[PDB]
């Protein structure tokens, strides 16, 4: 199954079937966050997906081809996290991103908290394009979570 769309990343080296993350299939390339697979090969039905490009510092990895997703947050508009939590249906959550200010520039961030196995869920703009992946972030004073909108090049 290479059909475009959002996919769960599952493993069974644990109790039952565990969802370790989420990813995006687009143009024959599977996109997810590095900490989800740590660069390991993946099975899709009868076929195998082998890693193609990865970068621990970006926390990204692609399978079967180079990174294809190149939309970016416009800065001004709200976005939607298409959260795919473990054992639960895909659900769109709309939000106005905050901002990670870094030495190298500014990155959109979303203040949404989901189980760890939601890592890799896509964030989308209003035209439906994937502007990044959810799951690499920080924990603020409150004790809850703000994820970067992590996009590749």
């Amino acid at each position: 199954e290479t059909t475009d769309g959002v996919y769960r990343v599952m493993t069974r080296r644990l109790l039952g079937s565990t969802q370790v993350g989420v990813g995006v299939m687009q143009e024959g390339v599977f996109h997810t966050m590095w900490h989800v697979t740590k660069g390991a090969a993946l099975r899709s039905g009868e076929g195998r997906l082998d890693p193609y490009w990865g970068d621990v510092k970006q926390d990204l990895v692609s399978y079967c081809g180079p990174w294809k997703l190149d939309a970016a947050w416009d800065g001004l508009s709200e976005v939607q996290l298409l959260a795919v939590p473990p054992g639960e249906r895909a659900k769109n959550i709309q939000t106005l991103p905050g901002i990670f200010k870094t030495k190298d520039g500014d990155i959109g961030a979303v203040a949404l908290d989901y189980p760890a196995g939601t890592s890799g869920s896509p964030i989308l703009d209003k035209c439906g394009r994937v502007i990044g992946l959810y799951g690499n972030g920080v924990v603020i004073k409150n004790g809850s979570y703000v994820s970067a909108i992590t996009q590749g090049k």
């Binding site: 996919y7 080296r13 993946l42 099975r43 926390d59 659900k91 920080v138």
Partner: protein, 38 residues
Amino acid sequence: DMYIERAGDITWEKDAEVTGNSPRLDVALDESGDFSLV
């Protein structure tokens, strides 16, 4: 062994739940890919 299974189309939902604020945070990204608050 890890395996993938489809969970849906990638589409904007007009009837979406809205939540979350929009904080501005000074962060650092280290060589391990971990953000930290500055």
